Amino acid sequence: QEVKPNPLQDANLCSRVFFWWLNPLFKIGHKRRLEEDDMYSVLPEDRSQHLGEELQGFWDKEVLRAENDAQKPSLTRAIIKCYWKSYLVLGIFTLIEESAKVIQPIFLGKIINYFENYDPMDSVALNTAYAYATVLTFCTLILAILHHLYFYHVQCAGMRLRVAMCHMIYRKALRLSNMAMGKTTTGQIVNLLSNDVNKFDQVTVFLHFLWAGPLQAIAVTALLWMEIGISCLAGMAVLIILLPLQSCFGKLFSSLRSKTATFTDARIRTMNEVITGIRIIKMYAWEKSFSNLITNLRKKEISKILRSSCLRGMNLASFFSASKIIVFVTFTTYVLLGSVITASRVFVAVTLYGAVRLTVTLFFPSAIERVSEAIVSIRRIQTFLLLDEISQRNRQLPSDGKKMVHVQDFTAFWDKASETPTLQGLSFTVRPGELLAVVGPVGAGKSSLLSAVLGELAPSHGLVSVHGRIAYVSQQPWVFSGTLRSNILFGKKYEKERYEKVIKACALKKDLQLLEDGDLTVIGDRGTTLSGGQKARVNLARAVYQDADIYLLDDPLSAVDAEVSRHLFELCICQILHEKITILVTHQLQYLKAASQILILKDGKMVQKGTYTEFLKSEGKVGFQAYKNYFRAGAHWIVFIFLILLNTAAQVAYVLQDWWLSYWANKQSMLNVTVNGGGNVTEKLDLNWYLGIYSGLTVATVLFGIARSLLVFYVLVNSSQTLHNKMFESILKAPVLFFDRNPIGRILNRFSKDIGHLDDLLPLTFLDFIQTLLQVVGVVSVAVAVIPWIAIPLVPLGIIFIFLRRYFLETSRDVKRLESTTRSPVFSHLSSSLQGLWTIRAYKAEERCQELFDAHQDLHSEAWFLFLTTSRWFAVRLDAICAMFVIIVAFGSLILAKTLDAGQVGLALSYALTLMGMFQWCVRQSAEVENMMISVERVIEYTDLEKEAPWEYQKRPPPAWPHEGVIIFDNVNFMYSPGGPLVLKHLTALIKSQEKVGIVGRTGAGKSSLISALFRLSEPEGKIWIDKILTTEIGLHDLRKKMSIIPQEPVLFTGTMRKNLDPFNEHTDEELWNALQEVQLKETIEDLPGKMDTELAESGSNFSVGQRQLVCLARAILRKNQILIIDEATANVDPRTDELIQKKIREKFAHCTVLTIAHRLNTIIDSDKIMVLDSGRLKEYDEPYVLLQNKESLFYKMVQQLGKAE
Ligand SMILES: C[C@@H]1CC[C@@]2(OC1)O[C@H]1C[C@H]3[C@@H]4CC=C5C[C@@H](OCCC(CO)CO)CC[C@]5(C)[C@H]4CC[C@]3(C)[C@H]1[C@@H]2C
Ligand SMILES: C[C@@H]1CC[C@@]2(OC1)O[C@H]1C[C@H]3[C@@H]4CC=C5C[C@@H](OCCC(CO)CO)CC[C@]5(C)[C@H]4CC[C@]3(C)[C@H]1[C@@H]2C
Ligand SMILES: C[C@@H]1CC[C@@]2(OC1)O[C@H]1C[C@H]3[C@@H]4CC=C5C[C@@H](OCCC(CO)CO)CC[C@]5(C)[C@H]4CC[C@]3(C)[C@H]1[C@@H]2C
Ligand SMILES: C[C@@H]1CC[C@@]2(OC1)O[C@H]1C[C@H]3[C@@H]4CC=C5C[C@@H](OCCC(CO)CO)CC[C@]5(C)[C@H]4CC[C@]3(C)[C@H]1[C@@H]2C
Ligand SMILES: C[C@@H]1CC[C@@]2(OC1)O[C@H]1C[C@H]3[C@@H]4CC=C5C[C@@H](OCCC(CO)CO)CC[C@]5(C)[C@H]4CC[C@]3(C)[C@H]1[C@@H]2C
Ligand SMILES: C[C@@H]1CC[C@@]2(OC1)O[C@H]1C[C@H]3[C@@H]4CC=C5C[C@@H](OCCC(CO)CO)CC[C@]5(C)[C@H]4CC[C@]3(C)[C@H]1[C@@H]2C
Ligand SMILES: C[C@@H]1CC[C@@]2(OC1)O[C@H]1C[C@H]3[C@@H]4CC=C5C[C@@H](OCCC(CO)CO)CC[C@]5(C)[C@H]4CC[C@]3(C)[C@H]1[C@@H]2C
Ligand SMILES: C[C@@H]1CC[C@@]2(OC1)O[C@H]1C[C@H]3[C@@H]4CC=C5C[C@@H](OCCC(CO)CO)CC[C@]5(C)[C@H]4CC[C@]3(C)[C@H]1[C@@H]2C
Ligand SMILES: C[C@@H]1CC[C@@]2(OC1)O[C@H]1C[C@H]3[C@@H]4CC=C5C[C@@H](OCCC(CO)CO)CC[C@]5(C)[C@H]4CC[C@]3(C)[C@H]1[C@@H]2C
Ligand SMILES: C[C@@H]1CC[C@@]2(OC1)O[C@H]1C[C@H]3[C@@H]4CC=C5C[C@@H](OCCC(CO)CO)CC[C@]5(C)[C@H]4CC[C@]3(C)[C@H]1[C@@H]2C
Ligand SMILES: C[C@@H]1CC[C@@]2(OC1)O[C@H]1C[C@H]3[C@@H]4CC=C5C[C@@H](OCCC(CO)CO)CC[C@]5(C)[C@H]4CC[C@]3(C)[C@H]1[C@@H]2C
Ligand SMILES: C[C@@H]1CC[C@@]2(OC1)O[C@H]1C[C@H]3[C@@H]4CC=C5C[C@@H](OCCC(CO)CO)CC[C@]5(C)[C@H]4CC[C@]3(C)[C@H]1[C@@H]2C
Ligand SMILES: C[C@@H]1CC[C@@]2(OC1)O[C@H]1C[C@H]3[C@@H]4CC=C5C[C@@H](OCCC(CO)CO)CC[C@]5(C)[C@H]4CC[C@]3(C)[C@H]1[C@@H]2C
Ligand SMILES: C[C@@H]1CC[C@@]2(OC1)O[C@H]1C[C@H]3[C@@H]4CC=C5C[C@@H](OCCC(CO)CO)CC[C@]5(C)[C@H]4CC[C@]3(C)[C@H]1[C@@H]2C
Ligand SMILES: CCCCCCCCCCCCCCCC(=O)O
C-alpha cells in the first residue's frame, strides 16, 4: 500500500523538533493494539537498497584504490569516506550542546552573585538578574527540548550504517564460493547479521564524545580555575583517579562473572537432565540425588553471584558518592589554602564538577568501549567480505540453437588441498529429452555428477558448452519465508492455465485438504506448517513451472511416491522435458529400469553406461502482590524497615552535605557584614567546627551509600536464592501430568532466563532505580524547602507526567513488541538463502532474493524508526517537564528575593540543574524494572504449582514389605483427568505369589497405563492392596523404591559410572564389582579410559544403546527387589543385545515376580502365563492350550495374524 508516507516528510521544523507529527500514531496506540499495518514506511533515502548500493560503491572504490596502491583494503576507510560529511555536520550541535552545558553554571553564578549583594532598592540589578535568568532558561531549553532531534539524527546515522552493512553482508553471502562456504558456517554469518552488526547502532551515539569529552573537560577546568584557583585541580584529580580504578574494578567484575557462568551452565545442564528425564527420575525414586547435586551447584553459583553483586553495589555506591568526594576534596583544599567560601563560587564549582564528572565517568568510557566494539565488528565484517567468491558466471557463448555437448578431461575436486583427486574420469554427452539415470549410495559422487553442470565443481581453465537453463532440485527441499504464491511464482509471471493444469493433473489437492487456506496459505516460520513432501513437490513444481532446459533433480522422488514420480515423469520429464536436458539422479531401483539410459560412477570411475541389457541387477501489569511476594522472600519486614531507613539516611546526608556548604557561605557572609559594617576586628570563622562537620557529613554520605547498596543487593539476591530453592523443590514434587502438559523448553527457559534475570539484572536495575528516584525526590524536596510555593505548580506538573507516562507506555510496549517480531524474518531469510544457495545461483535469481531481503530489512527498519522516534517523543516531553521545573525554580527565586539568601538560592538552582538527567534516568529505569518483574511473576507462579502425594509419610510400612511378592488389582479405574478419556475400566487382576507374567495391549492403548497405575506416579483412581496394604499408606518414595522397572528407552545421567549405577551409595563396592562381573560388564567399564570414575559424556552419547540396556539391567540387578517390570516396547533395539538381556533377566531374576509389557509376542510366549488385556477389559484368563484353541481369544487372533508358530 501507499502506507502513510512518513509524516517526517511533511513535518516542518517545529513539528520535527517537538515530534508533533507522531501524535496521531499514539492516538490509535491508545485506542487499540498496534499492528504492522499501522506502521510508517521508511523514508526514500533510508531504503535498504539505496544505502546498500551507496556503500557498495564506496567499498568497491576503496578496494580498487587499495589494489592500486598495493595495501590491504580497510572497511573503516570506506565507512568514513561515506558518512564523514553527514557526521561532521551533526557534530556542530554537539559542540553547541557542550558549550551550553559549560556556560550554564556561569549564569547560575551570576544569579547567585546578585543574591549575595542584595539591595531591595536597586532596580537595575534586579533587571540584570532577570536577564541572567532568561539566558539560563534559554540554555536549559537548548539542553532539554533541542537535543532530542540531534539525538534522533545520530541514531539514524547509526541505523543507516547498520542497514547498509546488512545489505553488504547478504549481497556477499549470496555470491560466496563453495570452498569459502565450507570454511565458514551459516551460523557465523547469521551471527554477523544478528549481534556483530548491532554495535553500529550504539557507537554512533557516543562517537562525537571522543572529542567532546577531552575538550569540554579542559574548558570546565579552566572555568573552575577562574572561580577557585589551584584548589580546582584537587577535585579534578579525584575525577581522573576515578577513571582507571573503576575500570580496573570492572576487569575484576568480568572475571567473577566468568566463574559464575561455568557454575550456571553446569546447573542448567542438570536442569535439562532432570526435566528431560523426569519420568525416569520419579520412576526410580532418584529425586534426592539430583536435589542435593543441584543444591550444591546452586550454592556455589550463589556464592559467586553474591561476591559479584557486592562488587557491583560498591561500584554503584562509588558512582553515587563520587560527586560528594570531589566537592569535599576541592573545597577542603580551598578553605585550607586561606580562602573564604561564598555561595556563588561554591555552587558554580558544584555544578561544573557535576557536569564534568557525569561526562568523564559516563560518556567518555562508554564512547571508548563502544568504539572498540564497533572496530572489532568492522574487522570481522571486513574479513568476511573479502572471502573468496564463486567464479563469476561468464557470458554464455552464442549457442545458436545447437546441441554440441561434450565433457573431456573433467577436473572436479571437492577439496583442492586434497592430493587425492575427488573425481578423474567423467565424460558423457546429454541429448535433448533423453534421461540419464545416475545412481550412487548415500550420495556416493552424486554431488560431482550434479555440479558437473557448472554448479560448483567448475574447471579452473576452459569452458564446457552447456546450453539452456538449469533447474536444480537439491537433496534438502527448501521453502523460503513467504507464501506458496512466492515459491510457485519465483519471479515467473502468473501463468493461470499451466499452473491450473499442473495443480489438477499433478493432483496437489493434498495441500488444499491439509492446509486450512490453500495455495494462498502463509508459510509459517521455517515452513513447519508444510512437510518435506510439500517442499519436494513444490521444488519439482517450481522446476517444471519455470520450464527450464537442464533439469537437475537430486533424488526428488525419494520424498514422493512411485505414482507421483511416474506422473511427473510422463507429464514433465516425458512431455514437458521432451527436448529438454533431464540429468536425473535416481535410486530405489524402479526408475532405473523405468528410464532408458543409466550412468553409474564410483570415485571418478564410470561403473557402466549401458541400459538394462547389461544384466547389472543393481506485557501486562504486575500487581502489588508480585512485588510483595518478591520482597518478603528476601528478608523479614524489619529488615525492609531498616533498609528504607538506611536509604532515607543516605539521601538526607547527601543533600545535607551541600546544605552545609550553603549554610557555611551564609554564615561567612553575615560574618563579613559584621566585620566590615560593624566591628573593625576581622573575626575569623572557626575552621575546626565547620570543616569537621563538613567532613563528617561527606563521610556519612559515603558510608550510608555503601551500606544501602550492599544491603539492597544482599536482600534481593537472597530473595532470588529463596525463590529458586522453593521453585526447584516444588517442581521436583510436581506430578508427571505437569511435565507432560508443559514442554521441556518452557520449564528450562523458566529455570534459565528468569533465574538469570533475578540473579544478575533485576537487583542491579532495582538498586539503580531506587537510587535515582531518591535523588529526584531529594532535588524536588530541596526546591520545595527553599521556596514552599513551588508546591503549588508541582501538583499539576507531576499529575501530567503520570498521565503522559501511561499515554506513552500503551504505545511504546507495542512498538517494542513489533520491533521484536520484525527482526527474525531477516535472519530466517538469510538462513534460507544460505541453505539453498545452490539453486538460487542455478536460477540466476540473485536479484530477486536481494529484493526480498531488502523488503524484509525495510520492515524492520520501519520498526526501528518507530522505536527511535517514540522514545524521542517521550524524552522531549519529559525534558520539557524538567525544564519547566527549572524555569519555575530560577524565576521564583527572583520573584521571592526579599525572603531568600544566597545559599538557599544556590542550593535549589544547582539541584534543579541536575533534575533533568536524573529524572530521565529514573523514568527509564522504572520502566525497565516494571518490564523485568514478569520473570519474578513467572518464578512465583512456579513456586506454588500443585504437587502430588508426599514421598514419605510419618507412618512407614515394614522394611521387609516385599516378602511375599503378591500384588493384585481390585477394581481400579485409572483417570488421567477427571471427566476425561477412559483408560482403565474396573481393572481387576490376580497375580500369584512369585509368578512371572506379562500382558499385551494395542499399540500402547492400556500398555503404559498399567505401569502408571502400579507405580502410582500418575495417581490411579483405584483401591489396591498389594500384600494386603493400601497403596496409599506407603509413601511415594517408599513405594517406588521397592519397584524395579526397565524403561523402553534407557537413559544415562552425567556423572561417574558409580553414581549412575548407584547414586545413593547404598551398595558396597565389591557388590557392584561382583554383580557387574557376573554380567561381564566390569571388563567393559574397566577398558574405559577413565576407569571407575570415567567422565561420562552428554547422557552417554558415545555409549551404544546395547550398553544402555546393559547398564539399566545392572541397575535392576543392584536394586535387588522382589518384583521387576520389563517395559520392552522399543522398536529400534539391537537384537543381539535383546537376546542377551532376555537370557540375563531369565537367569538373574529367575524367581522374581516380573510384569512384562511388550509388543514382541515371542517375548511373552516364554512367560508361563499371559493375561491379555485391552481397553480396560480383561479379555483372556485361561490355560495357554485354551488360548490356542479358542478362535475368539485375542491371543490366538494375533497368533493367526502374524503367522508365527511355536
Ligand atoms: C547564549 C549567549 C550567552 C552569552 C550572552 O548572549 C547569549 O548572554 C547575554 C546576556 C547579556 C547581558 C544581559 C543584561 C545585561 C544588563 C545590562 O544593563 C542594563 C540593564 C537593562 C536590561 O539589560 C535594563 O536597564 C548591561 C548588559 C548585560 C550585562 C548583558 C551583557 C551581554 C550578555 C552577557 C549577553 C551575552 C553575549
Ligand atoms: C593541566 C591542566 C590543563 C591546562 C590547565 O588546567 C590544568 O592549566 C591551568 C593553567 C591555568 C592558567 C594559570 C595562570 C593564569 C594567569 C592568571 O593571571 C595572571 C597572573 C599573574 C600574571 O600577571 C598576576 O596577574 C589568569 C589565569 C591563567 C591564565 C590560568 C588560566 C587557566 C589555566 C590555563 C589552566 C588550564 C585549564
Ligand atoms: C593533583 C594535585 C591535587 C592537589 C594539589 O595539586 C594537584 O593541590 C595543590 C595546591 C598546592 C599548594 C598551593 C600553593 C602553595 C605555594 C607555596 O606556598 C605558598 C602558600 C600558599 C597559601 O598561602 C600560596 O598560594 C608552597 C606550595 C603550596 C602550599 C602548594 C603545595 C602543593 C599543593 C598542595 C597542590 C596539591 C598537590
Ligand atoms: C585525592 C587527592 C589526594 C589528597 C590531596 O589531593 C587530592 O588532597 C589535597 C589537600 C592538600 C592540603 C590542603 C591544604 C594544605 C594546608 C597548607 O599547609 C601550609 C599552610 C600555609 C602554607 O600554604 C598557609 O596556606 C598547604 C598544604 C596543605 C597541607 C595541602 C597538602 C596537599 C593536600 C593534602 C592535597 C593532596 C595531594
Ligand atoms: C582530544 C583528542 C580526541 C581524540 C582522541 O584523543 C584525544 O581520543 C583518544 C581515544 C582513542 C581510542 C581509545 C580506545 C580505542 C579502542 C581500541 O580497541 C582496542 C582496545 C584494546 C587494546 O588493548 C583494549 O584496550 C582501538 C583504539 C581506540 C579506538 C582509540 C583510538 C584513538 C583515540 C580515538 C584517541 C584520539 C587521538
Ligand atoms: C532524626 C532525623 C535526623 C535528620 C533530620 O530529621 C530528623 O534532622 C533534622 C534536623 C534539621 C535541621 C535543624 C536545624 C536547621 C537549621 C536551620 O537554619 C537556621 C538558620 C539561622 C541562622 O541563619 C536562622 O534561624 C535550617 C534548617 C536545619 C538545617 C534543619 C534541616 C532539616 C534537618 C536536618 C532534619 C533532618 C531531616
Ligand atoms: C559519624 C561518623 C563518625 C565520626 C565522624 O565521621 C563520621 O563524624 C564527624 C563528627 C566530627 C566532629 C564534630 C564536631 C566537632 C567539634 C569541634 O571541636 C570543638 C569546637 C567547638 C565545639 O563547641 C568549640 O567550642 C570540631 C571537631 C569535632 C570534634 C569534629 C571532628 C571530626 C568528627 C569526629 C567527624 C568524624 C570523621
Ligand atoms: C542527623 C543529621 C546529622 C546532624 C545534623 O544533620 C542531621 O544536624 C544538623 C543540625 C545542625 C545545627 C543547627 C543549629 C546550630 C546552631 C548554631 O549556633 C549555635 C548557637 C545556639 C546553640 O548553641 C544558641 O547558643 C551552631 C551550629 C548548629 C549547632 C548546627 C550544626 C550542624 C548541625 C548539627 C547539622 C548536622 C549536619
Ligand atoms: C524525607 C527527606 C527528609 C529530609 C529532606 O529530604 C527529604 O527534607 C528536606 C528538609 C530540607 C530543609 C528544610 C528547611 C530548610 C531551612 C531553610 O532556611 C530558611 C529557614 C527560614 C525561612 O524563612 C525559617 O523558616 C533552608 C533550606 C533547609 C535547610 C532545607 C534544606 C533541604 C532539606 C534538608 C531536605 C532534606 C533532603
Ligand atoms: C517524598 C517527600 C515529598 C516532599 C518532601 O520530602 C520528600 O519535601 C520536603 C520539604 C519539607 C518542607 C521544607 C520546609 C518547610 C518550611 C518550615 O517552616 C516552618 C515555618 C515556621 C516553623 O517554626 C517558622 O519558620 C516547616 C517545614 C517545611 C514545610 C518542610 C516540611 C516537610 C517537607 C514538606 C518535606 C516533604 C515530606
Ligand atoms: C519528612 C520529614 C518531615 C519533618 C521534618 O523532617 C523530614 O521536616 C524537616 C523540616 C525542618 C524545619 C525546616 C525549617 C525550620 C525553620 C528554622 O528557623 C525557624 C525560625 C523561627 C523559629 O522560632 C524564628 O522565630 C528552624 C528549624 C526548622 C523549624 C526545621 C526543624 C526541623 C524540621 C521540622 C524537619 C522535620 C524533622
Ligand atoms: C495540595 C497541595 C498541598 C501542599 C501545598 O500545595 C497544595 O499547599 C500549599 C499551601 C501553602 C502555604 C499557605 C500559606 C502560607 C503562609 C505564608 O506566610 C505565613 C505568614 C503569615 C501571613 O501570611 C501567616 O498567615 C508562608 C507560606 C505558607 C506556609 C504556604 C507554603 C506553601 C504551601 C504549603 C503550599 C503547598 C505546596
Ligand atoms: C509542560 C510542557 C508543555 C506541555 C506539554 O509538554 C510539556 O505537556 C505534554 C503532555 C502532553 C499530553 C499528555 C497526555 C494527554 C492525554 C491524552 O488523552 C487522550 C484523549 C484523546 C487522545 O487519544 C482522545 O482519545 C490526549 C493527549 C494529551 C493531552 C497530551 C498532549 C500533548 C501534551 C500536552 C504535551 C505538551 C507538549
Ligand atoms: C513562573 C514561576 C513559577 C511560579 C511563581 O514564580 C514564577 O509565580 C510567582 C507568583 C507568586 C505569588 C504572587 C502573589 C502572592 C500574593 C501574596 O499575598 C498573599 C495574599 C493571598 C493572595 O492575594 C495569598 O494568601 C502572597 C504571595 C503570593 C501568593 C506569591 C507566592 C509565590 C508565587 C506563587 C511565585 C511562584 C514561585
Ligand atoms: C518522582 C516520581 C517519578 C519517578 C518514578 C516514575 C515511575 C513510577 C510512577 C508511578 C507508578 C506507575 C503509575 C501507576 C501505574 C500505571 O498506570 O502503570
CSV table of C-alpha atoms in Angstrom, one decimal, residues 164-373:
chain,number,residue,atom,x,y,z
A,164,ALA,CA,23.9,-0.7,4.7
A,165,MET,CA,26.2,-3.2,6.4
A,166,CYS,CA,23.5,-5.9,6.4
A,167,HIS,CA,22.8,-5.3,2.7
A,168,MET,CA,26.5,-5.7,2.1
A,169,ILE,CA,26.6,-8.9,4.1
A,170,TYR,CA,23.7,-10.5,2.3
A,171,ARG,CA,25.0,-9.5,-1.1
A,172,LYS,CA,28.3,-11.1,-0.3
A,173,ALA,CA,26.8,-14.2,1.1
A,174,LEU,CA,24.7,-14.8,-2.0
A,175,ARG,CA,27.9,-14.7,-4.0
A,176,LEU,CA,30.1,-16.8,-1.7
A,177,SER,CA,32.2,-19.6,-3.2
A,178,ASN,CA,31.9,-23.3,-2.4
A,179,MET,CA,35.2,-23.7,-0.5
A,180,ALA,CA,34.7,-20.4,1.3
A,181,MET,CA,31.2,-21.6,2.3
A,182,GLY,CA,32.9,-24.8,3.6
A,183,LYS,CA,35.5,-22.8,5.6
A,184,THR,CA,32.8,-20.8,7.4
A,185,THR,CA,29.3,-21.8,8.5
A,186,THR,CA,25.8,-20.3,8.2
A,187,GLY,CA,25.7,-19.8,11.9
A,188,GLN,CA,28.7,-17.5,11.7
A,189,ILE,CA,27.0,-15.3,9.0
A,190,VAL,CA,23.7,-15.2,10.9
A,191,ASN,CA,25.7,-14.1,14.0
A,192,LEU,CA,27.4,-11.5,11.8
A,193,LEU,CA,23.9,-10.1,10.8
A,194,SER,CA,22.5,-10.6,14.3
A,195,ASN,CA,24.8,-9.3,17.0
A,196,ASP,CA,28.0,-8.4,15.2
A,197,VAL,CA,26.3,-5.6,13.3
A,198,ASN,CA,24.1,-4.2,16.1
A,199,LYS,CA,27.2,-2.4,17.5
A,200,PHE,CA,26.8,0.2,14.8
A,201,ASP,CA,23.5,1.2,16.4
A,202,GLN,CA,25.4,2.2,19.6
A,203,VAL,CA,28.9,3.6,18.6
A,204,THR,CA,27.4,6.5,16.7
A,205,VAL,CA,25.6,7.6,19.9
A,206,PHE,CA,28.8,8.5,21.6
A,207,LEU,CA,31.3,8.8,18.7
A,208,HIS,CA,31.4,12.6,18.9
A,209,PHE,CA,32.1,12.5,22.6
A,210,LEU,CA,35.5,11.1,21.7
A,211,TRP,CA,36.4,14.8,21.0
A,212,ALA,CA,33.7,16.4,23.2
A,213,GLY,CA,34.9,14.7,26.4
A,214,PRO,CA,38.5,15.7,26.4
A,215,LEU,CA,37.7,19.2,25.1
A,216,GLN,CA,34.8,20.1,27.3
A,217,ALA,CA,36.6,18.8,30.4
A,218,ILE,CA,39.5,21.1,29.7
A,219,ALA,CA,37.2,24.1,29.3
A,220,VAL,CA,35.5,23.2,32.6
A,221,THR,CA,38.9,23.0,34.4
A,222,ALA,CA,39.7,26.5,33.0
A,223,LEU,CA,36.4,27.8,34.3
A,224,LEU,CA,36.9,26.1,37.7
A,225,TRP,CA,40.3,27.8,38.0
A,226,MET,CA,38.8,31.2,37.2
A,227,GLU,CA,36.5,30.5,40.2
A,228,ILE,CA,38.6,28.9,42.9
A,229,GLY,CA,42.2,28.8,41.7
A,230,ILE,CA,44.5,25.9,42.1
A,231,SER,CA,42.1,24.2,44.5
A,232,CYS,CA,40.1,23.1,41.5
A,233,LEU,CA,42.9,20.8,40.4
A,234,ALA,CA,42.4,18.7,43.6
A,235,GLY,CA,38.8,18.0,42.6
A,236,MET,CA,39.8,17.2,39.0
A,237,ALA,CA,42.5,14.9,40.4
A,238,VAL,CA,39.8,12.7,42.1
A,239,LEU,CA,37.9,12.6,38.8
A,240,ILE,CA,41.0,11.5,37.0
A,241,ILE,CA,41.6,8.9,39.7
A,242,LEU,CA,38.0,7.7,39.1
A,243,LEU,CA,38.8,6.6,35.6
A,244,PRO,CA,41.4,3.8,36.0
A,245,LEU,CA,40.3,2.4,39.3
A,246,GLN,CA,36.7,1.9,38.3
A,247,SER,CA,37.8,0.4,35.0
A,248,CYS,CA,40.3,-1.8,37.0
A,249,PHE,CA,37.5,-3.0,39.2
A,250,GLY,CA,35.4,-3.6,36.1
A,251,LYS,CA,38.1,-6.1,35.0
A,252,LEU,CA,37.7,-7.9,38.3
A,253,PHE,CA,34.0,-7.9,37.8
A,254,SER,CA,34.3,-9.7,34.4
A,255,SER,CA,36.5,-12.3,36.0
A,256,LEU,CA,33.9,-13.1,38.6
A,257,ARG,CA,31.2,-13.3,36.0
A,258,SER,CA,33.1,-15.9,34.1
A,259,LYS,CA,33.3,-18.2,37.1
A,260,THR,CA,29.6,-17.8,37.8
A,261,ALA,CA,28.9,-18.7,34.2
A,262,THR,CA,30.5,-22.1,34.4
A,263,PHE,CA,28.5,-23.0,37.5
A,264,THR,CA,25.3,-21.7,35.9
A,265,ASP,CA,26.0,-23.7,32.8
A,266,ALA,CA,26.5,-26.9,34.9
A,267,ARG,CA,23.4,-26.2,36.8
A,268,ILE,CA,21.4,-25.6,33.7
A,269,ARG,CA,22.6,-28.9,32.2
A,270,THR,CA,21.4,-30.8,35.2
A,271,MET,CA,18.0,-29.0,34.9
A,272,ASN,CA,17.8,-30.4,31.4
A,273,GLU,CA,19.0,-33.7,32.7
A,274,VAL,CA,16.2,-33.5,35.3
A,275,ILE,CA,13.4,-32.1,33.1
A,276,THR,CA,14.0,-34.2,30.0
A,277,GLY,CA,14.2,-37.5,32.0
A,278,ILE,CA,11.9,-36.6,34.8
A,279,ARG,CA,9.7,-39.6,34.2
A,280,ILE,CA,12.7,-41.9,34.8
A,281,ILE,CA,13.9,-40.0,37.8
A,282,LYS,CA,10.5,-40.2,39.5
A,283,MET,CA,10.2,-43.8,38.3
A,284,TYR,CA,13.5,-44.7,40.0
A,285,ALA,CA,13.0,-42.6,43.2
A,286,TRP,CA,16.2,-40.7,42.5
A,287,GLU,CA,14.9,-37.2,43.3
A,288,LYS,CA,17.1,-36.9,46.4
A,289,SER,CA,20.3,-37.3,44.5
A,290,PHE,CA,19.6,-34.7,41.8
A,291,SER,CA,18.2,-32.5,44.6
A,292,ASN,CA,21.4,-32.4,46.6
A,293,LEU,CA,23.5,-32.1,43.4
A,294,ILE,CA,21.6,-29.1,42.3
A,295,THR,CA,21.7,-27.7,45.8
A,296,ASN,CA,25.5,-27.9,45.8
A,297,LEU,CA,25.7,-26.3,42.3
A,298,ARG,CA,23.3,-23.5,43.2
A,299,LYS,CA,25.2,-22.9,46.5
A,300,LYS,CA,28.4,-22.4,44.6
A,301,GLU,CA,26.8,-20.3,41.9
A,302,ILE,CA,25.0,-18.1,44.5
A,303,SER,CA,28.3,-17.6,46.5
A,304,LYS,CA,30.0,-16.3,43.3
A,305,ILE,CA,26.9,-14.2,42.5
A,306,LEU,CA,26.9,-12.7,46.0
A,307,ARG,CA,30.6,-11.7,45.6
A,308,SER,CA,29.9,-10.2,42.2
A,309,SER,CA,26.8,-8.4,43.5
A,310,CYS,CA,28.8,-6.9,46.4
A,311,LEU,CA,31.4,-5.6,44.0
A,312,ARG,CA,28.7,-4.1,41.7
A,313,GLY,CA,27.0,-2.5,44.6
A,314,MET,CA,30.3,-1.0,45.8
A,315,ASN,CA,30.8,0.4,42.3
A,316,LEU,CA,27.3,1.9,42.2
A,317,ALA,CA,27.8,3.5,45.7
A,318,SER,CA,31.1,4.9,44.5
A,319,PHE,CA,29.4,6.4,41.4
A,320,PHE,CA,26.7,7.8,43.6
A,321,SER,CA,29.1,9.4,46.2
A,322,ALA,CA,31.8,10.5,43.8
A,323,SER,CA,30.4,14.0,43.5
A,324,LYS,CA,30.4,14.4,47.2
A,325,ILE,CA,34.0,13.2,47.5
A,326,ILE,CA,35.1,15.5,44.7
A,327,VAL,CA,33.5,18.6,46.2
A,328,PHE,CA,34.7,17.8,49.7
A,329,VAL,CA,38.3,17.4,48.5
A,330,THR,CA,38.3,20.5,46.4
A,331,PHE,CA,36.7,22.8,49.0
A,332,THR,CA,38.8,21.4,51.9
A,333,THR,CA,41.8,22.4,49.8
A,334,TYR,CA,40.1,25.7,49.0
A,335,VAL,CA,39.5,26.7,52.6
A,336,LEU,CA,42.7,25.3,54.0
A,337,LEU,CA,44.6,27.4,51.5
A,338,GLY,CA,43.4,30.6,53.2
A,339,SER,CA,40.4,31.4,51.1
A,340,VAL,CA,36.9,32.3,52.2
A,341,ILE,CA,33.9,30.5,50.8
A,342,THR,CA,31.0,32.2,49.2
A,343,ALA,CA,27.7,30.8,47.8
A,344,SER,CA,28.3,31.9,44.2
A,345,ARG,CA,31.7,30.3,43.8
A,346,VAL,CA,30.7,27.2,45.8
A,347,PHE,CA,27.7,26.4,43.7
A,348,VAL,CA,29.3,27.3,40.4
A,349,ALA,CA,32.1,24.8,41.3
A,350,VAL,CA,29.5,22.2,42.4
A,351,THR,CA,27.6,22.5,39.1
A,352,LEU,CA,30.7,22.5,36.9
A,353,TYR,CA,32.0,19.4,38.8
A,354,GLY,CA,28.7,17.7,38.4
A,355,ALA,CA,28.6,18.3,34.6
A,356,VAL,CA,32.3,17.3,34.0
A,357,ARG,CA,32.1,14.3,36.3
A,358,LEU,CA,29.0,13.0,34.5
A,359,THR,CA,30.7,13.4,31.2
A,360,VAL,CA,34.1,11.9,32.2
A,361,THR,CA,32.7,9.0,34.1
A,362,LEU,CA,29.7,8.1,31.9
A,363,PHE,CA,30.1,9.2,28.3
A,364,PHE,CA,33.8,9.1,27.6
A,365,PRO,CA,34.4,5.5,28.9
A,366,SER,CA,31.2,4.4,27.2
A,367,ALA,CA,32.4,6.0,24.0
A,368,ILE,CA,35.7,4.2,24.2
A,369,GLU,CA,34.1,0.9,24.8
A,370,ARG,CA,31.5,1.2,22.1
A,371,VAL,CA,34.1,2.4,19.6
A,372,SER,CA,36.4,-0.6,20.4
A,373,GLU,CA,33.4,-2.9,20.0
